[PDB]
């Protein structure tokens, strides 16, 4: 009990966050159906214990949609500063990425710091895994320096890891938005029901996504295009097919479509047919090629039984 | 029509709003399961009818889990201010906890001020009934005094009770936190389906909490463990047992569980099986001693049945 002044790291935060106060801020939230990202991650997880590779996390594919959705809007990127007395809009050369990264200290406080991915417009997903695995990597074993802590556009925050469903964070000085990614669970009400019966039903899991942006620069009607552009970039058919080219998955990615009632041939008729379509034709997808290699001259046979 | 001059303790409300505008907030929300609330307390609420006793509250039983959340994470109790120039953390010595009482005035606008039930981290469920009901009282019939608004470090409100879904209150200066309760009913989208559909399915009431803090001492991650631990809390055996305890319920509580399928032995047989218990065993339960004794040399019968 009693009065202790403030030092340190913890003196450095509590100043930026009084700086805060002269942003004026507003939020949008939405929030977005999650089945098909568990169901693809588990396919290129499944490749990698193959190739004793590593896993990939749902921090990853979020985040990597995020930048394509920053490209898709760029007024998302833009800040405000008062230079010469007059007020200005900034536009950067890049799309530098902020990772909340939460390091201890020698005395044992956690302290969060800010370290950034650079020029993340240029990457594909391969190299946008590798450019993220060496931050987390190096911050770890202490290796990071000034420069890694300098020049954030947009920033990626992660509430969803303890359980919580939605927050409203402060933006500080410099940036123009802020995302924060929510909890993949069920709803509460359906917290205490069978797996036998929401397997009936047809209820999904979800994932809630906030944005909270300056008004000076950034305008209400923006911030909902960007949002509805990262809905639609997790059920696409060419956002999983690029990411599946990159890390070498051989199948097709499972396509997103509404569940269909069990009426006219029954469903068990309908799994008997696939046991043969494999038993036949599956010989026509197998990893036979020791090289990437498809003769252009010879056609290719269908394979969409 | 017109301009009217504010005065009086609509004055003082207003001064202090502005005054609110030097401390930068974030929330944090939260939904949690309700189901094992509804049914524990129908219990106490029986046991307290046979005794002429009164009726315990939601309010009651959040609060109480509220101050146990506090003493699992303290960080959550301290504040911030500015002593001989130089900024300072203050730890406070006791958890006092703030109740929004509203209270009418003698022309007849309605105005809310905080009182405060005080040193909460010493009491057990009953001692803190005894000490919320105190303040209640008090006042109803004026004769709550000068001491009883000074000293509050957290405070909790409830918008559920016209029935809001949840809200983003503003912090009053000397506090860090202030949690709100919203509303306990069924979502929106089944507030139009049959009982008997709910019933088969296994669709739970849910209640959202939210907290909202000053970042320049509580960060993030500890405002997310404060929330977990509360939803942990509601749905606890030990929680429960010492609730039941303090109010002398002779029965065992309801637990947690997830609804199980109506496979193999039938339900209706389960049923019939558990009349046949009772009439067989149920007397190794009954209120017929006298004392509050079990002699410690004899052995217990099992009474799992």
């Given at each position: 009990?009693?009065?202790?002044?403030?030092?340190?790291?913890?003196?450095?935060?509590?100043?930026?966050?009084?700086?805060?106060?002269?942003?004026?801020?507003?939020?949008?939230?939405?929030?977005?159906?999650?089945?098909?990202?568990?169901?693809?991650?588990?396919?290129?997880?499944?490749?990698?214990?193959?190739?004793?590779?590593?896993?990939?996390?749902?921090?990853?594919?979020?985040?990597?949609?995020?930048?394509?959705?920053?490209?898709?809007?760029?007024?998302?990127?833009?800040?405000?500063?008062?230079?010469?007395?007059?007020?200005?809009?900034?536009?950067?050369?890049?799309?530098?990425?902020?990772?909340?990264?939460?390091?201890?200290?020698k005395?044992?406080?956690?302290?969060?710091?800010?370290?950034?991915?650079?020029?993340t417009?240029?990457?594909?997903?391969?190299?946008?895994?590798?450019?993220?695995?060496?931050?987390?990597?190096?911050?770890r074993?202490?290796?990071?320096?000034?420069?890694?802590?300098?020049?954030?556009?947009?920033?990626?925050?992660?509430?969803?890891?303890?359980?919580?469903?939605?927050?409203?964070?402060?933006?500080?000085?410099?940036?123009?938005?802020?995302?924060?990614?929510?909890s993949?669970?069920?709803?509460?009400?359906?917290?205490?029901?069978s797996?036998?019966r929401?397997?009936?039903?047809?209820?999904?899991?979800?994932?809630?996504?906030?944005?909270?942006?300056?008004?000076?620069?950034?305008?209400?009607?923006?911030?909902?295009?960007?949002?509805?552009?990262?809905?639609?970039?997790?059920?696409?058919?060419?956002?999983?097919?690029?990411?599946?080219?990159?890390?070498?998955?051989?199948?097709?990615?499972?396509?997103?479509?509404?569940?269909?009632?069990?009426?006219?041939?029954?469903?068990n008729?309908?799994?008997?047919?696939?046991?043969?379509?494999?038993?036949s034709?599956?010989?026509?997808?197998?990893?036979?090629?020791?090289?990437?290699?498809?003769?252009?001259?010879?056609?290719?046979?269908?394979?969409?039984?």
């Open positions: 009990p009693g009065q202790t002044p403030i030092r340190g790291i913890f003196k450095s935060i509590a100043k930026n966050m009084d700086i805060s106060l002269e942003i004026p801020t507003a939020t949008s939230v939405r929030d977005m159906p999650a089945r098909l990202m568990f169901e693809n991650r588990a396919m290129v997880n499944d490749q990698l214990k193959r190739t004793r590779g590593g896993k990939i996390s749902f921090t990853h594919i979020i985040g990597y949609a995020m930048v394509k959705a920053v490209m898709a809007h760029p007024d998302m990127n833009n800040s405000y500063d008062v230079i010469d007395g007059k007020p200005t809009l900034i536009v950067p050369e890049h799309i530098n990425l902020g990772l909340a990264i939460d390091l201890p200290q005395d044992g406080s956690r302290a969060l710091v800010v370290a950034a991915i650079k020029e417009e240029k990457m594909n997903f391969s190299e946008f895994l590798a450019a993220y695995e060496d931050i987390v990597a190096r911050s074993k202490g290796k990071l320096t000034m420069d890694d802590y300098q020049g954030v556009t947009v920033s990626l925050t992660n509430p969803g890891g303890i359980g919580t469903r939605h927050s409203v964070p402060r933006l500080t000085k410099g940036q123009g938005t802020i995302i924060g990614v929510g993949m669970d069920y709803p509460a009400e359906f917290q205490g029901a797996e036998d929401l397997a009936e039903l047809g209820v999904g899991k979800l994932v809630t996504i906030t944005s909270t942006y300056d008004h000076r620069v950034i305008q209400g009607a923006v911030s909902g295009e960007f949002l509805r552009t990262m809905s639609r970039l997790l059920t696409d058919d060419s956002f999983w097919d690029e990411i599946f080219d990159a890390m070498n998955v051989p199948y097709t990615p499972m396509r997103w479509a509404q569940d269909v009632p069990n009426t006219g041939v029954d469903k008729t309908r799994v008997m047919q696939l046991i043969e379509a494999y038993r034709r599956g010989h026509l997808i197998a990893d036979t090629n020791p090289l990437s290699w498809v003769q252009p001259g010879m056609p290719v046979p269908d394979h969409r039984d």
